[PDB]
Amino acid sequence: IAKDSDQNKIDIYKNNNGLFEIDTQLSNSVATNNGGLAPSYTENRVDAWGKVEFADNSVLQARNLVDKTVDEIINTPEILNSFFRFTPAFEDQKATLVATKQSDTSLSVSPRIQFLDGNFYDLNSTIAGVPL
Amino acid sequence: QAVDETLTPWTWNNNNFSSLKITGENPGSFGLVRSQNDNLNISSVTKNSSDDNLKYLNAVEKYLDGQQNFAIRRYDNNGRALYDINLAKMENPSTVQRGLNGEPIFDPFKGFGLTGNAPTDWNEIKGKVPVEVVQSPHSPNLYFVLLVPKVALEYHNLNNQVVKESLEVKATQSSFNPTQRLQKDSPVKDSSKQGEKLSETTASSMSSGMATSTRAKALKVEVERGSQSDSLLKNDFAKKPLKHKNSSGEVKLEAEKEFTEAWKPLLTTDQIAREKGMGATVVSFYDAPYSENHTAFGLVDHIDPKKMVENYPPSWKTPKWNHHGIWDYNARNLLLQTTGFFNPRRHPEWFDEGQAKADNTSPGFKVGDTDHKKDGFKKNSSSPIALPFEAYFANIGNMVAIGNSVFIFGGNGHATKMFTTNPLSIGVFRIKYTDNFSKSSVTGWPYAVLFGGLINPQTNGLKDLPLGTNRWFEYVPRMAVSGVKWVGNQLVLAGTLTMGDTATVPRLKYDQLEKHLNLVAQGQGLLREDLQIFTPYGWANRPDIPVGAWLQDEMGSKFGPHYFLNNPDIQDNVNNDTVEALISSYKNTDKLKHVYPYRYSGLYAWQLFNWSNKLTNTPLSANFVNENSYAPNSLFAAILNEDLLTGLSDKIFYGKENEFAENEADRFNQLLSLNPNPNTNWARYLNVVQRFTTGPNLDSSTFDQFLDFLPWIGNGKPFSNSPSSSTPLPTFSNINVGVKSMITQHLNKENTRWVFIPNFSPDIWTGAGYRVQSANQKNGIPFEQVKPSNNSTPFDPNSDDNKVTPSGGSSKPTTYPALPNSISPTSDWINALTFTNKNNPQRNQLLLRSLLGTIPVLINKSGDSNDQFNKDSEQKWDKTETNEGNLPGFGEVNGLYNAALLHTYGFFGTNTNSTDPKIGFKADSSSSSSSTLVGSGLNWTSQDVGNLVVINDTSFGFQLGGWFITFTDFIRPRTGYLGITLSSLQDQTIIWADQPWTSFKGSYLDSDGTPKSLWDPTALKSLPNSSTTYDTNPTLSPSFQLYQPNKVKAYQTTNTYNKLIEPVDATSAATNMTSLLKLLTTKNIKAKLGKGTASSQGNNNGGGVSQTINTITTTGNISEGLKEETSIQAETLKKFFDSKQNNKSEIGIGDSTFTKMDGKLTGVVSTPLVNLINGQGATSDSDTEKISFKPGNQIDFNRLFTLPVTELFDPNTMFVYDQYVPLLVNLPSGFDQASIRLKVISYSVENQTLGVRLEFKDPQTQQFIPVLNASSTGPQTVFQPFNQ
Ligand SMILES: [K+]
Structure with missing residues (x-):
């Protein structure tokens, strides 16, 4: 964190085989917080949170998962990793889907994604008790 | 597409590659193959006198496109061929099609998607031959291959009047004489300019001192900038009161009056960069063994010379200049040497005009004008360092891959080497991939900046080697490279390396060149030898006295108080009253420095310890660099x-932190080190090396004991001589040479009883050629060897030039109380750096050159009629005190002993041959005498390095000429282990060949757990001519050199070695020694030794397989020969070796075992299970027959x-x-x-x-393998519900 003139700016330096170099795209990704405590999420962009594309609903019929119940699927995290394709912003950045039962017949999923600090963030994350 | 059996596997001489083992998801082999056909008459491509090389080289490539075929076939895991890949001829060539994320589109049974169009530059890649292949560490099915023009293979088969040696053979019509080529005449004081010499200090500051003397004062040197636009106000380093001789014109380096048909590159660096067909190429490619679309290309990159040459350091724009500048430039040009640090007179292989610029003129600086204040400013350069054709292909080969990148560490240089021309790997190229392998980039850098972090902590071998550097990259390391490989988790490099030049750190007095012809010829590029030679009687007091100071005693009548001859006994005594007159007053300033009225002196080790580019404990520290190796x-x-x-x-x-000083005022107050500038990055590259190794893990004279323990490959006898009155003596170590005496009388006469030896008597062996008053008075010598300047009486002790007058009026003579007992080049003194001659550089130089077996010997006498020297009644091994011991005392190789080396070679006596050859050296008291160096009889050289091979997680080794060497402990050192193992070849038909390395067919790891190599005695060829019509005395060949006459005065009949031996004018001496001039050519040595023809006997054919000695965890344990508790460590190691002379294999030293084969050996191809010879040796894989898909x-x-x-x-x-x-x-029953x-x-x-x-x-290994016989689609199949 530095000031060029008088406002604070966030640069991210990435270690490359023992030598740190600025990453200008990741710097812009992290610095785009829109006044929030953490970097924005954009659906169509590899941002600080990588990029998550969900499967169409039509995957259930094609793979015969309609014969599985919500509780089965919900306790089978390898099935529900097959509900999205993830593009990491930095090598070995990881992401999983947290599942929530919505009805007898349906669930929702929401990504849990590592940031630069090796930690996973999701909808309920806090720092100092403050929801992000 | 499909396999053609008419192409057969082969090994390239420059990298020794022949196959890659594929690893991971689909194992197997790629390997090089070529057409078998004979009668390749390249000389039919006629060369005219009126045109340049480029159209000829393109006509040779067009001819080779008709006369030969080359390919890179795939083999399965057992060595069965799969598909052909003749890159000049294959059908429908294409790059691989990509998705939007850069990934290649693929499905294993279909193979890759092909775009239907070839890569870029396909119209000029199709003529190139592939020469090395590697695989990606992280990406599946992705490979890289390196390609070159076919002349990079055929270079020695091109016609001899264009592919010339760097030196001419001549017609010898007046008879041969090696002195006729040498520029020799010494400089003299200028008859019209005597007065411009340095001024004597008229009054000297007290500095709270007290003592006084009658002697002349120190000489002032001053430099300051003034106000003038193109001149200094003072510049005393640029004075020039000496000038060159006139002898039918001026003597100087002037290439156009010496080189009437000057040697030049096949192509220049600016040709190879722009003529895209002549540059080397790397391509990425994709492969799968059982697909429909089995192979296709990725991307193409040029290994462009400009991507290396534009990354040379700023000083490489001016290789005729160095950071010491004007005084060093003048001192080198006055001695007729190479100026700067890299000029083409020694090193023509890196210059676009070759020998045609072999001169000291116009060094990129203003020099030689009418005023010393006008000289010393930066200007335009006359010749930068380049990368011409010969050096370029020596910088090609030895690949490795790391992450999204691949490298080229350069070859051994056998692509482009000639018998007087030494191209090498000078650095590393890298090729890098970007946008998920959608794009690529290419670069390279010299080893000079990559090795800049080397320090004494980073090696378990000897310390202080000539490998150091500073803020200017004037030290230029280059290598013959054995390879780069993964040793378990660690990336490792191996080969042979150039030190700084150890042969010219000691420097001559200006007039005496006519009695020192070899020492100037070794600097002239006329003698291309890197070994240190014993020459002390003609050296100056320091290497670094400026040329304006020298002319202070032209008569020698004062023994030159500021500058005189290096004799160790007559050094000025500083005592303690003396210092106030000679140093303890002359304070320097920001414009004033001094040359002292003090007689400095010391032998070869003290010279190197002060002015060699030695390693130290911190990087960039070495302020002194001499010159770079041949x-x-x-x-x-x-x-x-x-x-x-x-x-x-x-x-x-x-940046400017790596530039030389722009004018001499910035040279006088010159900054030794600087921080990197904000835009620069050179300091990041210094640290690519973690650790290095150079030889055995041994310290002091113990290392000379290992040098004596190993056998000479020409006869199987160890240089230690102990395994059989009047017995012969060893050459490298001092143990049992001469006699023992206590050092208690030497130098300070203190500490010796308790802080030198573990014992009450301070015993040291006095060595060959020593001084004593009697056999009873065996300890020390007094100052009795006083010496005259001419006939003008002795050194004059108790005289007022050799006295001082401190307060109280007491006075004493300024000379030694007592001195060491020997000055000979074998000397090994612990207490006396100024009298010891052995040094750690020489120990490492001798290690390498004694393995290759090509240390030279000094000769007076040949086997010819009335010229003979005898084994008996003419040599007295028991009497080293007199001339009957035949110790030369001049021109001898440093650290060792000549008569012992001649005995181990068997040049006299029946040791090597069925009758006495009678060749040798004799010291006589009756007359003046003449001598020369000659070769050992062997034709191996330090560029003869083969494949690096890795044996397990910590052990690795390589082929080096007639040896395989292993560095078993380098990754995990231990106490009491020497760290090295060695296996020697035995076959006399190989060892006595004329171009012996051409018989080596490659070296490889084998699946029984040993390294192995192939040889063929039918592969050798004749020299470039058969002498045809005249007596060829100078036969240009890989062990030949233009060694000069040495002429020497008669020896004293008794007390022979009490003073240094005196040389005399050698400029006409050749007429007395014509037998020795004929003996310079190795074939004439072999003929007199009985080795030159069919009298060598043994196998007529007998090609086949060689294997290193067996090994266990105990092998190389020498813990009883290491450490001390009674004596000196070399002597207990000598005792430990003497009982083991017949049992060397437990030391890790011995001969390689060998087995013969029928027919020709051309090369090998390798798999993780098996090795195939000429591509034969495959099997049915019988353990896997019963496994099959339904x-x-x-x-x-x-x-x-x-x-x-x-x-x-x-x-x-x-x-x-x-x-x-x-x-x-x-699957079978019971499976x-x-x-x-x-x-x-x-x-x-x-x-x-x-x-x-x-x-x-795998039944043989703790690992899984595919089952290649499992279906008609190999180890792969598909299953589906009838919808195929
Ligand atoms: K995103």
Whole structure:
């Protein structure tokens, strides 16, 4: 964190085989917080949170998962990793889907994604008790 | 497309590559092959006198495109050929098609998607031959290959009037004489300019001192800038009161009056960069063994010379200049030497005009004008360092891959080497990939900046080697490279390396060149030898006295108080009253420095200890650098930062911190070190080396004991001589040479009783050629060897020039109380750096050159009629005190002893031959005498380095000429282990060949757990001519040199070695020694030794396989020969070796075992299970015959495919579950069902199709392998519900 003139700016330096170099795209990704405590999420962009594309609903019929119940699927995290394709912003950045039962017949999923600090963030994350 | 059997496998001389082992998902081999056909008459491509080389080289490539074929076929894991890949001829060439994320589109049974169009530059890549192949460490099915013009193979088969030696053979019509080529005449005081000499200090500051003397004062040197636009106000380093001789014109380096048909490159660096067909190329490619679309290309990159040459350091624009500048430039030009640090008179291989610029003129600085204040300013350069054709292909070969990048460390230089021309790897190229392998980039850098972090902590061998550097990259390391490989987790480099020049750190007095012809010829490029030679009687007091100071005693009548001859006994005594007159007053300033009225002196070790580019404990420290080596003179292996080699930026940026001083006022107050500027990055590259090694893990004279322990390959006898009155003496170590005496009388006469030897008597062996008053008075000598200047009486002790007058009026003579007992080049004194001659550089130089067996010997006498020297009645091994011991005392190789080396070679006596050859050296008291160096009879050289091979997680080795060497302990050192093992070849038909390395066919790791190599005695060829019509005395050949006459005065009949031996004018001496001039050519040595023809006997053919000695954890343990508790460590190691002279294999030293084969040996191809010779040796794989996939008529589809294919395998790892294996694969009765399983390779659930590959436990190894016989589609198959 530095000031060029008088406002604070966030640069991210990435270690490359023992030598740190600025990453200008990741710097812009992290610095785009829109006044929030953490970097924005954009659906169509590899941002600080990588990029998550969900499967169409039509995957259930094609793979015969309609014969599985919500509780089965919900306790089978390898099935529900097959509900999205993830593009990491930095090598070995990881992401999983947290599942929530919505009805007898349906669930929702929401990504849990590592940031630069090796930690996973999701909808309920806090720092100092403050929801992000 | 399909296999053609008419192409056969081969090994390239420059990298020794022949095959790559593929690893990971689909194992097998790639290997080089070529057409078998004879009668390749390249000389039919006629060369005219009126045109340049380029159209000739293109006509040779067009001819070779008709006369030969070359290809890179794939083989399976047992060595069965799969597809041909003749890159000049293959059908429908294409790059691979990509998705929007850069990934290649692929499906294993179909193969890759092809775009239907060839890569860029396909119209000029199709003429090139592939010469090395490697695989990506992280990306599947992705490979890299290096390609060159076919002249980079055929270079020695091109016609001899264009592919010339760097020196001419001549017609010898007046008879041969090696002195006729040498510029020799010494400089003199200028008859019209005597007065411009340095001024004597008229009054000297007190500095609270007290003592006084009658002697003349120190001389002032001053430099300051003034106000003038192109001149200084003072510049005393640029004075020039000496000038060159006139002898039918002026003597100087002036290439156009010496080189009437000057040697030049095949192509210049600016030609090879722009003529895109003549530059080397790397390409990426994709491969799969059983697909329909089995192979296609990725991307193409030029290994462009400008991407190396524009990354040379700023000083390489001016190789005729160095950071010491004007005084050093003048002192070198006055001695007729190379100026700067890299000029073409020694090193023509890196210059676009070759020998035609072999001169000291116009060094990029203003010099030689009418005023010393006008000289010393930066200007335009006359010749920068380049990368011409010969050096370029020596910088090609030895690949490795790391992350998204691949490298080229350069070859051994056998692509482009000639008998007087030494191209080498000078650095590393890198090729890097970007946008997920959608794009690429290329670069390279010299070893001079990459090795800049070397320090004494980074080696377990000897310390202070000539490998150091500073803020200017004027030290230029280059290598013959053995390879780069992974030793377990560690990336490792191996080869042979150039030190700094150790032969010219001591420097001559200005007038005496006519009695020192070899020492000037070794600097002139006329003698291309890197060994240190004993010459002390003609050296000056220091290497670094400026040329304006020298002319202070032209008569010698004061023994030159500021500058005189290096004799060790007559040094000025500083005592303690003396210092106030000679140093303890002359304070320097920001414009004033002094030359002292003090007689400095010391022998070869003290010279190197002060002015060699030695290593130290911190980087960039070495302020002194001399010159760079002719050829590799060190072993070298190292551990690299594979991460930093991946992390460093493509472009190196230097700056003003690496520039020489713009004018001499900035040279007088010259900054030794600087921080990197904000835009520059050169300091990042210094740290790519973690650790290095250079020889045995031994310290002091113990290392000379190892040098004496190893056998000479010409006769199998160790240089220690102990395994059989009047017995012969060893050459390298001092143990049992001369006699023992206590050092208690030497120098300070103190500490010796308790802080030198573990024992009450301070015993040291006095060595060969020593001084004593009597056999009883065996300890020390007094100052009795006083010496005259001419006939003008002795050194005059108690005289007022050799006295001082401190307060109280007491006075004493300024000379030694007592002195050491020997000055000979074998000397090994612990207490006396100024009298010891052995040094750690020489120990490493001798290690390498004694392995290759090519240390020279000094001769007076040949086997010819009335010229003979005898084994008996003419040599007295028991009487080293007199001339009958035959110690030369001049012109001898440093550290060793000549008569012992002659005995070990067997040049006199029946040691090497069935009758006495009678060749040798004799010291006589009756007359003046003449001598020369000659070769050993062997033709090996330090560029003869082969494949690096890795044996396990810590042990690795390589071929080096007639030896295989192993560096077993370098990754994990231990106490009491020497760290090296060695295996020697035995075959006399190879060892006595004329170009011996051409018989080596490659070296490889073998699956029984040993390294092995191939040889063929039918592969040798004749020299470039058969003498044809005249007596060829100078036969240009790999061990030949233009050694000069040495002429020497008569020896004293008794007390022979009490003073240094005196040389005399050698400029006419050749007429007395014509037998020795004929003996310079190795074939004439071999003829007199009985080795020159069919009298060598043994096998007429007998090509085949060679293997290193057996090894165990005890091998190389020498813990009883290491450490001390009674004596000196070399002597207890000598006792430990003497009982083991017949049992060397437990020391790790011995001969390689050998087996013969029928027919020719051309090369090998390798797999993780087997090695194939000429491509033969494959087998039925009998342990795997009973394993097979079920055929389509044996599948009950409803049993397999009522469930979707989605859950037949674990999603975490893609192996199929065990229950489906016997449903898809047949297996024998009693089989272990846990030993085999199926891996999914592609599938689609909407088609219910599953594609698989099978893997099985290897019966020989703790690892899985594919089962290649499992189907008509190999180890791969598909299964689906009838919808195929
Ligand atoms: K995103």
